Design an enzyme around this catalytic site. Sequence first.
Site, PDB file in Angstrom:
ATOM      1  N   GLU A  68       0.814  -1.209   0.000  1.00 41.66           N
ATOM      2  CA  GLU A  68       0.000   0.000   0.000  1.00 41.66           C
ATOM      3  C   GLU A  68       0.850   1.263   0.000  1.00 41.66           C
ATOM      4  O   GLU A  68       0.932   1.959  -1.010  1.00 41.66           O
ATOM      5  CB  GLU A  68      -0.949   0.005   1.203  1.00 41.66           C
ATOM      6  CG  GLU A  68      -2.221  -0.792   0.977  1.00 41.66           C
ATOM      7  CD  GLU A  68      -3.074  -0.212  -0.134  1.00 41.66           C
ATOM      8  OE1 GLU A  68      -3.276   1.019  -0.145  1.00 41.66           O
ATOM      9  OE2 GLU A  68      -3.535  -0.985  -0.999  1.00 41.66           O
ATOM     10  N   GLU A 308      -3.730  19.566  40.134  1.00 40.47           N
ATOM     11  CA  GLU A 308      -4.865  20.299  40.683  1.00 40.47           C
ATOM     12  C   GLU A 308      -4.640  21.808  40.689  1.00 40.47           C
ATOM     13  O   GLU A 308      -5.565  22.583  40.447  1.00 40.47           O
ATOM     14  CB  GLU A 308      -5.161  19.819  42.103  1.00 40.47           C
ATOM     15  CG  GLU A 308      -5.304  18.316  42.227  1.00 40.47           C
ATOM     16  CD  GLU A 308      -5.459  17.867  43.661  1.00 40.47           C
ATOM     17  OE1 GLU A 308      -4.831  18.484  44.547  1.00 40.47           O
ATOM     18  OE2 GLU A 308      -6.215  16.903  43.904  1.00 40.47           O
TER      19      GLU A 308
HETATM   20  N1  LIG Z   1      -1.067  31.611  55.291  1.00 44.38           N
HETATM   21  C1  LIG Z   1      -1.716  30.645  55.980  1.00 44.38           C
HETATM   22  N2  LIG Z   1      -1.862  30.716  57.319  1.00 44.38           N
HETATM   23  C2  LIG Z   1      -2.509  29.755  58.003  1.00 44.38           C
HETATM   24  N3  LIG Z   1      -3.057  28.663  57.438  1.00 44.38           N
HETATM   25  C3  LIG Z   1      -2.985  28.468  56.101  1.00 44.38           C
HETATM   26  C4  LIG Z   1      -2.292  29.475  55.283  1.00 44.38           C
HETATM   27  N4  LIG Z   1      -2.359  29.052  54.010  1.00 44.38           N
HETATM   28  C5  LIG Z   1      -3.033  27.877  54.012  1.00 44.38           C
HETATM   29  N5  LIG Z   1      -3.406  27.526  55.255  1.00 44.38           N
HETATM   30  C6  LIG Z   1      -4.160  26.296  55.605  1.00 44.38           C
HETATM   31  O1  LIG Z   1      -3.709  25.211  54.795  1.00 44.38           O
HETATM   32  C7  LIG Z   1      -4.805  24.555  54.163  1.00 44.38           C
HETATM   33  C8  LIG Z   1      -4.431  24.215  52.730  1.00 44.38           C
HETATM   34  O2  LIG Z   1      -3.482  23.152  52.736  1.00 44.38           O
HETATM   35  P1  LIG Z   1      -2.750  22.768  51.363  1.00 44.38           P
HETATM   36  O3  LIG Z   1      -3.373  23.610  50.281  1.00 44.38           O
HETATM   37  O4  LIG Z   1      -1.267  22.868  51.615  1.00 44.38           O
HETATM   38  O5  LIG Z   1      -3.055  21.222  51.038  1.00 44.38           O
HETATM   39  P2  LIG Z   1      -4.537  20.619  50.905  1.00 44.38           P
HETATM   40  O6  LIG Z   1      -5.527  21.674  51.310  1.00 44.38           O
HETATM   41  O7  LIG Z   1      -4.521  19.272  51.578  1.00 44.38           O
HETATM   42  O8  LIG Z   1      -4.725  20.413  49.323  1.00 44.38           O
HETATM   43  P3  LIG Z   1      -6.163  20.011  48.712  1.00 44.38           P
HETATM   44  O9  LIG Z   1      -6.671  21.276  48.069  1.00 44.38           O
HETATM   45  O10 LIG Z   1      -5.812  18.910  47.741  1.00 44.38           O
HETATM   46  O11 LIG Z   1      -7.001  19.594  49.894  1.00 44.38           O
HETATM   47  C9  LIG Z   1      -5.993  25.497  54.238  1.00 44.38           C
HETATM   48  O12 LIG Z   1      -7.173  24.791  54.629  1.00 44.38           O
HETATM   49  C10 LIG Z   1      -5.631  26.511  55.299  1.00 44.38           C
HETATM   50  O13 LIG Z   1      -6.398  26.258  56.476  1.00 44.38           O
HETATM   51 MG   LIG Z   2      -3.609  20.177  47.779  1.00 43.14          MG
END
Ligand SMILES: Nc1ncnc2c1ncn2[C@@H]1O[C@H](COP(=O)(O)OP(=O)(O)OP(=O)(O)O)[C@@H](O)[C@H]1O
Ligand SMILES: [Mg+2]
Lengths: 494, 490
Positions: A68, A308
């Site tokens: 072909e 994500e």
């Molecule tokens: N500047 C900050 N001060 C205090 N706490 C914080 C701050 N930033 C984020 N957090 C806390 O960290 C959490 C987010 O965790 P991270 O995003 O690291 O992983 P994750 O939430 O497990 O990811 P996923 O979105 O997959 O659940 C939030 O719920 C918040 O309560």
């Molecule tokens: Mg996360």
Amino acid sequence: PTEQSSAEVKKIPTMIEGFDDISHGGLPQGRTTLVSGTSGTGKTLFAVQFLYNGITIFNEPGIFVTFEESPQDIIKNALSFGWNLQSLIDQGKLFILDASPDPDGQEVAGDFDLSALIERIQYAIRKYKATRVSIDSVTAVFQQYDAASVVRREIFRLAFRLKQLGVTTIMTTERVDEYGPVARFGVEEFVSDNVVILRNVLEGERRRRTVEILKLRGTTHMKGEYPFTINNGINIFPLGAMRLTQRSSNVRVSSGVKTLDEMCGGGFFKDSIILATGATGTGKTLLVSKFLETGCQQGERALLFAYEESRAQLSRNASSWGIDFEELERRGLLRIICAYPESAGLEDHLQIIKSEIADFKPSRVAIDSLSALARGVSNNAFRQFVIGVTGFAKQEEITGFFTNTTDQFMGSNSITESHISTITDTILLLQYVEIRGEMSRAINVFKMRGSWHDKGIREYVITEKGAEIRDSFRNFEGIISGTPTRISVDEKTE
Amino acid sequence: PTEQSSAEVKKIPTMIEGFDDISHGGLPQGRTTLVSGTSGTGKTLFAVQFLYNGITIFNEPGIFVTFEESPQDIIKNALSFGWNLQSLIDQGKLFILDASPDPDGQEVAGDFDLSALIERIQYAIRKYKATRVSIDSVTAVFQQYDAASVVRREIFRLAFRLKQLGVTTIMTTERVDEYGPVARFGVEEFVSDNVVILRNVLEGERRRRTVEILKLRGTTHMKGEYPFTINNGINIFPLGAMRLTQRSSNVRVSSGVKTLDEMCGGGFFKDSIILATGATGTGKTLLVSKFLETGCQQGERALLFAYEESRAQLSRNASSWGIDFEELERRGLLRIICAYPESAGLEDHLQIIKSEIADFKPSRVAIDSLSALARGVSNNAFRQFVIGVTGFAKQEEITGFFTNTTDQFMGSNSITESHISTITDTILLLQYVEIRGEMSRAINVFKMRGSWHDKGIREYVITEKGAEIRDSFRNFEGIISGTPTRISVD
Ligand SMILES: Nc1ncnc2c1ncn2[C@@H]1O[C@H](COP(=O)(O)OP(=O)(O)OP(=O)(O)O)[C@@H](O)[C@H]1O
Ligand SMILES: [Mg+2]
Ligand SMILES: Nc1ncnc2c1ncn2[C@@H]1O[C@H](COP(=O)(O)OP(=O)(O)OP(=O)(O)O)[C@@H](O)[C@H]1O
Ligand SMILES: Nc1ncnc2c1ncn2[C@@H]1O[C@H](COP(=O)(O)OP(=O)(O)OP(=O)(O)O)[C@@H](O)[C@H]1O
Ligand SMILES: Nc1ncnc2c1ncn2[C@@H]1O[C@H](COP(=O)(O)OP(=O)(O)OP(=O)(O)O)[C@@H](O)[C@H]1O
Ligand SMILES: [Mg+2]
Ligand SMILES: [Mg+2]
Ligand SMILES: [Mg+2]
């Protein structure tokens, strides 16, 4: 110890990656092998790579017969894989025989007179002293008006006289359905000594390439379908032939969190796979960020696969913890691969992980949410995926950090709802704890395979300083329930 | 007129392993048997092994008739199992009849088939005084013929002439479906007295070979599909036929932990199957390591099948417990295997496990994580594996140690989710207990069929010296929940 004889059937190596393992050595010498498949499944590639690898690795001349595609189109298409067949044609090692029909008749009456090409193919084998032969699209030559009986005997003649000349042969045939007959006329597979089936199955809008050896007469072979990818040629990864033989060591690395290191009795193992699991908002991504940041602080490269969040979104959240992904990236100590899980198949996802790891050559690798990759796919495919990534990471002595978000906050009685916790060396459990009407967080090192670890379910807070791990709730009951019961009585203090 | 029969229909043994059991004796003698299947099912092996076993074991000459495969290929392919076919041909015991047509081409003389074919076959039957005949691929001489009615007569005429000569025949036939019609023309089934079907079903991405006896006229046979593997030829495992005929003794064996030995009322049985179930990180592998070590401290050899850890990692973890694996292969007492569960089907796993036994002949055998081999496979196929493996060790007086990880780390109300605990002699149960905000763990001997055992759920600690088994939580309730409560109204 060979043993118990004999001359028997021996094999010719194909050097197609992973194929010689599932074929237990390669293709049976002096015999015709039938490669079957639907559209765009890799038959045409299989036949060329069989010749190309024979010429450049074993110095065995090859002849490619096409019915072909034109010779020039076969040479042009092979250039995508970085190899030119023209130089081999020039050296007299490769010969592409044009059996393609002239764009006019006639016609004829059984189309070709046969005998020659069988003489033509014979003449070419003599002239170039070839040991390997690939016949592409044997099916196309038949369809004029051929009952299954005629096709049966015609393949037999071809295979037989090629068997005389001591030549290993690859014959390509077409399918219509993915799990119906092996070939188009339901006969070819019975007349052939050897049968390989290339498949391109759906499964929920994603595509999956599989290879299978149905039968090898007179010898052994692995059985069933095996995932492969088209990349630098055909890239078969046997999900089982990946020998369960990786190293191990008592070398420790840090998580970036001081208390977490004490809790793991000096920190993670360099030769380990860590799983951070818990509900959402718990802080799985924070621990990933610190795990990678420390590597960079040591001068070693870190590689992150995010599914994500985006880089700017990752850099913003991370910056709030004091760490700068932005600078670490432009220096070449950190690489963040952001991709949508649904963009490709888990087999295609696995390739990118391998390729990026080989290129970047990191000492730490993180995957933000394995659970994100487990959506819409069979648990068999996902668990097969984890083994691939986990095994390959352990093989290259790269510290693995995986996260898993549980669909169930509070009162989850399972670490992972996809059940992959037996593939992991280390498990970090994160969960919500209800203390006085407020949502507290607790951390637990669930297991350390080669180490003593802290047993306490310890409260932690997230701040600008990151994770601040504290004491365990020593006056509560049913903490893993998520809803503790304060039992400060008996007060047991007089 | 005076009856003269005078019992029933008689069978000849094929000696193909496991086939004579599912055939309730063998193949109906003086009759043809249809062995049907798809490509790469084992039809030609069945045909060849039928003649080979009939020659080397019973000194009965055989004739192999081929229409496609050449004699040289049949001889050469049979060398794969170590079958010296050519020597038999020299002795005049075997004759391969090449009825394959010409690579030049011809059509019209397809009707001279049978008519001249029958005459040749029967001459060869007389010449070599043969009692067994295999005709491989009688389907090939059917160029669609003239529909299927012509096929019906031709098969009938063939089997009839073979009947008069008093030979037992095997005719193989191709089929394109695994569960469609048995043969190509949908006729072969009814004309043949006996029908055997070889299957190579997919079900996932692992192949599973089964053999079924559909019908044997005038005789009995086992019903349904039976799993077989190919190594020395067709090796059928009538996993549901190994009649419960195993020995048993009260001989005690040590686990490795003295505190556990007392809990089990002196230790394990030598004729035992010990199941260790629990969550992840509980210590199943630790107790397995102790079980294998202890035997190698007795001069007895041990066998380990690992499906989730590597020899290097197994050695590292064990060496951390003061258990030196490396010296055990040195003595040659311990042998690791290490394989991936997805590498092969469960039948191929069983076979591999069996071969390692035959090679080694171990006193103790452990299979780490049975739960690993239950992934992505039907529980019906998993139980068949377990029974075969469990039953095999009982046959050879081998102590069986098996593990199983429960998917739920707390609140688990069942020993196994695969429901195979009913076929286990001893069960030791591992679980996490939340005591005062920390994760304690507890060991419990759940049941033991021939012995008294400790009924306590004892707290145990894993150290650098292995597992130390301590007290029972006397002051708690709901330990099984994983979240106990302290009571002290006492
Ligand atoms: N500047 C900050 N001060 C205090 N706490 C914080 C701050 N930033 C984020 N957090 C806390 O960290 C959490 C987010 O965790 P991270 O995003 O690291 O992983 P994750 O939430 O497990 O990811 P996923 O979105 O997959 O659940 C939030 O719920 C918040 O309560
Ligand atoms: Mg996360
Ligand atoms: N450089 C490359 N990288 C990745 N994939 C490629 C590359 N080149 C080609 N392919 C893939 O290979 C497939 C074509 O395979 P090939 O032409 O070898 O056999 P085939 O298409 O099955 O034969 P036919 O359809 O003509 O019977 C295409 O679908 C394409 O996606
Ligand atoms: N040494 C061996 N060990 C294990 N399996 C083998 C060995 N040799 C051959 N086999 C198996 O035997 C199968 C071939 O069976 P055989 O050729 O006897 O009959 P068949 O395939 O039904 O015939 P056909 O398909 O040509 O009509 C192959 O699939 C191969 O896996
Ligand atoms: N040196 C050590 N000191 C204290 N505890 C240890 C030590 N080594 C291991 N452990 C404990 O042993 C546990 C590991 O158990 P093992 O690997 O024997 O089987 P398992 O973890 O139940 O298997 P799976 O991988 O299915 O969970 C770890 O959770 C850890 O708590
Ligand atoms: Mg092509
Ligand atoms: Mg055959
Ligand atoms: Mg283990």
